[PDB]
RNA sequence: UAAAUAUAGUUUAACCAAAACAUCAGAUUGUGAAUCUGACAACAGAGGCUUACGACCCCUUAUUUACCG
């Protein structure tokens, strides 16, 4: 490709430009069609070499200091295995959710919505979300709704879980929630919903869009629940937090450590406690 | 507080290092009859403003043109359909804190100043520095702006100031790649200053070898010039072709101009002697004409809610209306029309705004509930029972303006037009850009309308309901010429005090109370004391051409010297105005078994609080004095910007009651028909009333905390 | 309408420049696994400029405050 035509002199024109570069992300690079997008891309670029190599730095510098502590310097009831015996015991509460346990539906119908950079974005909130849910004492069912086998998000959560992703405890489908569930238990929940939500109700399906906007698109969601006949609810930000900074619309990790708080019989002053504190000053 | 001058440094002692990287040139008023002819200079570090008409205001708001970062307001001649208008910038000026604005142009804006601070607050908190053509050259971090008077061969109104803006020169881009094969580190804060000497251009000694730094950077720009004149007749065109500074920079090939706006009409533009004064700049030279030859669209809003409401009524809500090859080529001016300066020299017509109909009657029937409930009301009205009590087409009310202070793109300020007869009308009052509003409305009927202007009331001497007037009477003497009738002063009935800002204006600024009769408020009461007999006949004269049986007036409660009105008709319908006002008794003696009543209903129920502070009512109050005044009708008006778009509907909302629109006909042929509007009215607002309902509810979260 | 702001896991720090805490996959761990090997690292967004940068300038969305002679 031609395209090195700009790197070869950005280097030498004193931007920030990665060193490294392979043709699958030289191919990305021609896809940003302007200076700006461009200039925006190659300092993301330029960054992932400058956190590699110093936290590469870090850890054979701890090799060293280990080994030379590690070389100069009973009656047990259980062998070190804990991390194998704490996946067992997720895995059996994660079988018996999603047997008994609540649903709980994430929406993948917003692939067309997302960049490049938001979709990879949804993964990383969508993988720490589950993780949650994993450890938590009552998981949730977990859904996977509207999610294409060959769409671009489902490469993706692919790639993330590699071989984990057909052993997972949640339900994925190509179905909506519309066709699994009843209308009437349904709520989706979005931060421009006019009904405030009031308790965890749990005899209904919460859906969460999976969109991180970060190009902010108000209403993508709400105009999703209202082209079906679902009913939505929002969080009580405003009825307990004194808002000052940044964006109401949370993310996927910090609401479903919510729900998963409301579920378990806690107030909305401990369930409120994962939204950033960055935003607020205080509950109120 | 404002960002532009907090981030003072930033901007750099000589720009940022030599010059603004992009300067262009928009037009805001393409020289149409009512939007008047303005332009706009839009700099890195500055903004400028030149000939800020009546309404330009509004314009420039309207299109997200930014007020709080003017630096200079050129005029070009000492005239109110220049200079007009005014008065409401330093306003928008004072309230965005803006610390200093400077004014250029001819020496009587001193007098100018001096004159609006009758009516106006003494401007605390602004500074207003008027710089006249004999100071010297005015240069900035962007510009040099060259100001040149000029005399007609006929205060002063033969002069007119024209001018000759010069870009500054704006340091080439350096070839920093070119450097590392000579040897410079491109590296940072590594031998960094020699770009400040490669922007300068002088030798720096590096790897050995001096070398004159233009040769490792691009050719600076000269900085491209322009020229801001205008020719108000023909009584201009020669002083203007023979001046002496002009010929330098025309003739002259080391000082080209890029372009050259002309604020003439199209009388003087073909005329021979202007002609040889275009091709004598040169071919180079782009010229732009702002005059009334312009077909386009200003207030796009006006024009795009008075379509949608046109679906529900056309009666009631009529259409607004829209009001020779040359030898040297030339570009008609147009709103939002573009020119760049710098780095490009071209004409940018992206932004000019595009007025299709047929988008804005689309909009209305996607809409969730309009074309059901326009449908609804349709039917009701046209095939249902008769359509409201059969009384003649006239008296009819013309809502020109229903803005509490400021102008908003939906709304303007309070000005209202009342058809006593096709032959007299008279107008309830004049706010800023009435004849704007006026000449939107009627188009080419517009000097008609003028001619049937019998005489004009001003409720109080706040800006927002007189600041207009004079701009009407030059449109009307001018009207009143077209139409060949002899010229009469103009019947003026407003409070004594309203003569200080005329005689300061007549006296100082221009000539324009040879066509004002004015009658004051004070002798229109009832059981008023006998005035001077030249004050008599005149009240003979306004009963007679206007046809009114009676003309009273009281003081209404509001600041000192305020009137309320009320218009008698031989025929019998009786017609009451009230200013901005409280519930008054005195009012409601006035106005008994009136016809119609036209009363104030600014703000929300339940801010009584802020109302009495503000000497203003509420809706609620408003409809209460109706039930108290026994009339047939009651018309609201007086919004404040809360309201932005649309009245809040109140459960006391009655048949008696009703609301008011710009450019909106009302007639006592249509009061019941009022009541049955509001169906089809929410459901065009619905986004919008949510909006108000929810801030409604916000304050009473602050009142709850 | 204007000014302030806007960290997509969370905080801190900021012209310091990357941390600290977290997250995902693999691990039969002899009790420092308190680890190892990988995955992901975008300070609202889209554009301009500039040798550059998080700076500067428009624009979009949003948040908190104020908002008429
Ligand atoms: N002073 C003031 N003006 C406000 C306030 N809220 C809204 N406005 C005014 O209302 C305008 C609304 O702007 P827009 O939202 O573009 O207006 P719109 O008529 O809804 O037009 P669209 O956005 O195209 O739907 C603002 O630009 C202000 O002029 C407020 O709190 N204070
Ligand atoms: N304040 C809030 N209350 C309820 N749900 C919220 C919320 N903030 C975010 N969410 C949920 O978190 C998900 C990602 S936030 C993104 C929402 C979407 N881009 C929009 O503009 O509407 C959404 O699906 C939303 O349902
Ligand atoms: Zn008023």
């Given at each position: 490709?031609?395209?090195?035509?700009?790197?070869?002199?950005?280097?030498?024109?004193?931007?920030?430009?990665?060193?490294?570069?392979?043709?699958?992300?030289?191919?990305?690079?021609?896809?940003?069609?302007?200076?700006?997008?461009?200039?925006?891309?190659?300092?993301?670029?330029?960054?992932?070499?400058?956190?590699?190599?110093?936290?590469?730095?870090?850890?054979?510098?701890?090799?060293?200091?280990?080994?030379?502590?590690?070389?100069?310097?009973?009656?047990?009831?259980?062998?070190?295995?804990?991390?194998?015996?704490?996946?067992?015991?997720?895995?059996?509460?994660?079988?018996?959710?999603?047997?008994?346990?609540?649903?709980?539906?994430?929406?993948?119908?917003?692939?067309?919505?997302?960049?490049?950079?938001?979709?990879?974005?949804?993964?990383?909130?969508?993988?720490?979300?589950?993780?949650?849910?994993?450890?938590?004492?009552?998981?949730?069912?977990?859904?996977?709704?509207?999610?294409?086998?060959?769409?671009?998000?489902?490469?993706?959560?692919?790639?993330?879980?590699?071989?984990?992703?057909?052993?997972?405890?949640?339900?994925?489908?190509?179905?909506?929630?519309?066709?699994?569930?009843?209308?009437?238990?349904?709520?989706?929940?979005?931060?421009?919903?006019?009904?405030?939500?009031?308790?965890?109700?749990?005899?209904?399906?919460?859906?969460?869009?999976?969109?991180?906007?970060?190009?902010?698109?108000?209403?993508?969601?709400?105009?999703?629940?209202?082209?079906?006949?679902?009913?939505?609810?929002?969080?009580?930000?405003?009825?307990?937090?004194?808002?000052?900074?940044?964006?109401?619309?949370?993310?996927?990790?910090?609401?479903?450590?919510?729900?998963?708080?409301?579920?378990?019989?806690?107030?909305?002053?401990?369930?409120?406690?994962?939204?950033?504190?960055?935003?607020?000053?205080?509950?109120? | 507080?404002?960002?532009?001058?907090?981030?003072?440094?930033?901007?750099?002692?000589?720009?940022?290092?030599?010059?603004?990287?992009?300067?262009?040139?928009?037009?805001?008023?393409?020289?149409?009859?009512?939007?008047?002819?303005?332009?706009?200079?839009?700099?890195?570090?500055?903004?400028?403003?030149?000939?800020?008409?009546?309404?330009?205001?509004?314009?420039?708001?309207?299109?997200?043109?930014?007020?709080?970062?003017?630096?200079?307001?050129?005029?070009?001649?000492?005239?109110?359909?220049?200079?007009?208008?005014?008065?409401?910038?330093?306003?928008?000026?004072?309230?965005?804190?803006?610390?200093?604005?400077?004014?250029?142009?001819?020496?009587?804006?001193?007098?100018?100043?001096?004159?609006?601070?009758?009516?106006?607050?003494?401007?605390?908190?602004?500074?207003?520095?008027?710089?006249?053509?004999?100071?010297?050259e005015?240069?900035?971090?962007?510009?040099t702006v060259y100001q040149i008077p000029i005399?007609?061969?006929?205060?002063?109104?033969?002069?007119?100031?024209a001018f000759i803006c010069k870009l500054?020169?704006?340091?080439?881009?350096?070839?920093?790649?070119?450097?590392?094969?000579?040897?410079?580190?491109?590296?940072?804060?590594?031998?960094?200053?020699?770009?400040?000497?490669?922007?300068?251009?002088?030798?720096?000694?590096?790897?050995?070898?001096?070398?004159?730094?233009?040769?490792?950077?691009?050719?600076?720009?000269p900085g491209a010039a322009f020229v801001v004149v205008?020719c108000?007749?023909?009584?201009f065109i020669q002083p203007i072709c023979e001046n002496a500074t002009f010929q330098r920079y025309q003739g002259k090939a080391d000082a080209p101009v890029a372009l050259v706006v002309h604020?003439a009409?199209?009388?003087?533009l073909?005329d021979s002697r202007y002609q040889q004064w275009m091709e004598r700049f040169g071919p180079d030279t782009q010229h732009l004409?702002?005059?009334?030859?312009?077909?386009?669209?200003?207030?796009?809003?006006?024009?795009?809610?008075?379509?949608?409401?046109?679906?529900?009524?056309?009666?009631?809500?009529?259409?607004?209306?829209?009001?020779?090859?040359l030898s040297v080529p030339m570009?008609?001016?147009?709103?939002?029309?573009?020119?760049?300066?710098?780095?490009?020299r071209?004409?940018?017509?992206?932004?000019?705004?595009?007025?299709?109909?047929?988008?804005?009657?689309?909009?209305?029937?996607?809409?969730?509930?309009?074309?059901?409930?326009?449908?609804?009301?349709?039917?009701?009205?046209?095939?249902?029972?008769?359509?409201?009590?059969?009384?003649?087409?006239?008296?009819?009310?013309?809502?020109?303006?229903?803005?509490?202070?400021?102008?908003?793109?939906?709304?303007?300020?309070?000005?209202?037009?009342?058809?006593?007869?096709?032959?007299?009308?008279?107008?309830?009052?004049?706010?800023?850009?009435?004849?704007?509003?006026?000449?939107?409305?009627?188009?080419?009927?517009?000097?008609?309308?003028?001619?049937?202007?019998?005489?004009?009331?001003?409720?109080?001497?706040?800006?927002?309901?007189?600041?207009?007037?004079?701009?009407?009477?030059?449109?009307?003497?001018?009207?009143?010429?077209?139409?060949?009738?002899?010229?009469?002063?103009?019947?003026?009935?407003?409070?004594?005090?309203?003569?200080?800002?005329?005689?300061?204006?007549?006296?100082?600024?221009?000539?324009?109370?040879?066509?004002?009769?004015?009658?004051?408020?004070?002798?229109?009461?009832?059981?008023?004391?006998?005035?001077?007999?030249?004050?008599?006949?005149?009240?003979?004269?306004?009963?007679?051409?206007?046809?009114?049986?009676?003309?009273?007036?009281?003081?209404?409660?509001?600041?000192?010297?305020?009137?309320?009105?009320?218009?008698?008709?031989?025929?019998?319908?009786?017609?009451?105005?009230?200013?901005?006002?409280?519930?008054?008794?005195?009012?409601?003696?006035?106005?008994?078994?009136?016809?119609?009543?036209?009363?104030?209903?600014?703000?929300?129920?339940?801010?009584?609080?802020?109302?009495?502070?503000?000497?203003?009512?509420?809706?609620?109050?408003?409809?209460?004095?109706?039930?108290?005044?026994?009339?047939?009708?009651?018309?609201?008006?007086?919004?404040?910007?809360?309201?932005?778009?649309?009245?809040?509907?109140?459960?006391?909302?009655?048949?008696?009651?009703?609301?008011?629109?710009?450019?909106?006909?009302?007639?006592?042929?249509?009061?019941?028909?009022?009541?049955?509007?509001?169906?089809?009215?929410?459901?065009?607002?619905?986004?919008?009333?949510?909006?108000?309902?929810?801030?409604?509810?916000?304050?009473?979260?602050?009142?709850?905390?």
């Amino acid at each position: 490709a031609a395209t090195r035509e700009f790197i070869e002199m950005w280097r030498l024109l004193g931007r920030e430009v990665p060193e490294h570069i392979t043709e699958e992300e030289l191919k990305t690079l021609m896809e940003c069609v302007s200076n700006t997008a461009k200039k925006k891309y190659l300092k993301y670029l330029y960054t992932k070499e400058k956190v590699k190599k110093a936290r590469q730095i870090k850890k054979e510098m701890k090799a060293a200091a280990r080994e030379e502590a590690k070389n100069i310097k009973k009656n047990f009831l259980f062998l070190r295995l804990w991390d194998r015996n704490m996946d067992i015991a997720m895995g059996w509460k994660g079988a018996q959710a999603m047997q008994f346990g609540q649903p709980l539906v994430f929406d993948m119908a917003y692939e067309n919505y997302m960049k490049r950079k938001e979709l990879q974005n949804t993964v990383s909130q969508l993988l720490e979300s589950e993780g949650w849910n994993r450890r938590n004492v009552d998981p949730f069912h977990i859904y996977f709704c509207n999610l294409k086998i060959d769409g671009a998000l489902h490469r993706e959560l692919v790639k993330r879980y590699q071989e984990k992703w057909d052993k997972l405890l949640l339900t994925s489908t190509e179905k909506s929630h519309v066709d699994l569930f009843p209308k009437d238990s349904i709520i989706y929940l979005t931060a421009d919903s006019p009904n405030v939500m009031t308790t965890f109700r749990h005899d209904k399906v919460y859906v969460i869009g999976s969109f991180v906007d970060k190009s902010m698109q108000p209403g993508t969601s709400l105009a999703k629940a209202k082209r079906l006949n679902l009913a939505t609810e929002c969080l009580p930000l405003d009825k307990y937090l004194q808002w000052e900074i940044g964006n109401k619309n949370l993310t996927l990790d910090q609401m479903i450590r919510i729900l998963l708080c409301l579920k378990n019989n806690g107030n909305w002053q401990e369930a409120l406690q994962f939204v950033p504190k960055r935003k607020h000053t205080g509950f109120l | 507080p404002l960002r532009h001058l907090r981030t003072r440094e930033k901007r750099g002692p000589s720009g940022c290092s030599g010059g603004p990287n992009t300067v262009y040139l928009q037009v805001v008023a393409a020289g149409s009859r009512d939007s008047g002819a303005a332009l706009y200079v839009f700099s890195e570090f500055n903004r400028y403003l030149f000939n800020c008409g009546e309404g330009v205001q509004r314009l420039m708001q309207e299109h997200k043109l930014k007020v709080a970062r003017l630096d200079n307001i050129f005029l070009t001649r000492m005239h109110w359909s220049n200079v007009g208008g005014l008065s409401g910038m330093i306003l928008t000026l004072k309230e965005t804190g803006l610390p200093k604005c400077v004014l250029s142009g001819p020496p009587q804006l001193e007098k100018y100043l001096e004159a609006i601070k009758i009516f106006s607050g003494p401007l605390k908190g602004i500074e207003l520095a008027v710089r006249p053509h004999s100071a010297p050259e005015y240069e900035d971090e962007t510009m040099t702006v060259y100001q040149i008077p000029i005399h007609s061969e006929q205060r002063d109104s033969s002069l007119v100031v024209a001018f000759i803006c010069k870009l500054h020169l704006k340091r080439g881009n350096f070839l920093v790649l070119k450097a590392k094969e000579m040897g410079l580190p491109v590296g940072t804060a590594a031998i960094a200053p020699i770009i400040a000497a490669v922007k300068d251009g002088k030798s720096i000694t590096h790897e050995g070898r001096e070398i004159l730094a233009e040769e490792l950077c691009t050719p600076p720009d000269p900085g491209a010039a322009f020229v801001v004149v205008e020719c108000p007749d023909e009584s201009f065109i020669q002083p203007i072709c023979e001046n002496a500074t002009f010929q330098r920079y025309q003739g002259k090939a080391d000082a080209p101009v890029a372009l050259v706006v002309h604020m003439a009409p199209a009388s003087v533009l073909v005329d021979s002697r202007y002609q040889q004064w275009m091709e004598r700049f040169g071919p180079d030279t782009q010229h732009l004409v702002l005059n009334e030859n312009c077909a386009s669209v200003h207030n796009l809003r006006s024009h795009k809610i008075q379509t949608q409401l046109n679906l529900i009524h056309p009666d009631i809500f009529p259409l607004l209306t829209s009001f020779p090859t040359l030898s040297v080529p030339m570009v008609q001016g147009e709103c939002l029309l573009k020119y760049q300066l710098r780095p490009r020299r071209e004409w940018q017509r992206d932004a000019i705004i595009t007025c299709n109909p047929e988008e804005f009657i689309v909009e209305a029937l996607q809409l969730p509930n309009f074309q059901q409930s326009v449908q609804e009301y349709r039917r009701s009205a046209q095939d249902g029972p008769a359509p409201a009590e059969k009384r003649s087409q006239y008296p009819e009310i013309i809502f020109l303006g229903t803005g509490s202070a400021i102008p908003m793109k939906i709304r303007n300020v309070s000005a209202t037009l009342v058809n006593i007869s096709p032959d007299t009308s008279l107008l309830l009052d004049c706010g800023e850009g009435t004849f704007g509003q006026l000449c939107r409305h009627y188009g080419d009927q517009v000097d008609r309308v003028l001619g049937t202007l019998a005489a004009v009331f001003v409720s109080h001497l706040a800006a927002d309901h007189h600041t207009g007037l004079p701009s009407i009477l030059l449109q009307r003497e001018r009207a009143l010429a077209s139409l060949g009738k002899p010229l009469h002063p103009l019947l003026v009935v407003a409070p004594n005090q309203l003569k200080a800002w005329l005689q300061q204006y007549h006296n100082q600024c221009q000539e324009v109370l040879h066509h004002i009769s004015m009658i004051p408020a004070k002798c229109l009461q009832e059981g008023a004391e006998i005035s001077s007999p030249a004050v008599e006949r005149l009240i003979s004269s306004l009963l007679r051409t206007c046809d009114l049986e009676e003309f009273q007036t009281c003081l209404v409660r509001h600041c000192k010297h305020a009137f309320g009105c009320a218009l008698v008709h031989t025929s019998g319908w009786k017609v009451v105005y009230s200013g901005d006002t409280m519930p008054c008794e005195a009012l409601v003696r006035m106005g008994k078994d009136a016809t119609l009543l036209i009363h104030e209903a600014t703000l929300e129920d339940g801010l009584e609080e802020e109302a009495v502070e503000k000497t203003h009512s509420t809706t609620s109050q408003a409809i209460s004095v109706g039930m108290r005044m026994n009339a047939e009708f009651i018309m609201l008006n007086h919004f404040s910007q809360r309201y932005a778009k649309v009245p809040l509907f109140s459960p006391n909302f009655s048949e008696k009651v009703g609301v008011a629109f710009d450019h909106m006909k009302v007639c006592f042929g249509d009061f019941p028909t009022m009541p049955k509007l509001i169906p089809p009215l929410k459901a065009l607002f619905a986004g919008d009333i949510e909006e108000m309902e929810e801030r409604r509810e916000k304050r009473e979260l602050r009142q709850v905390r």
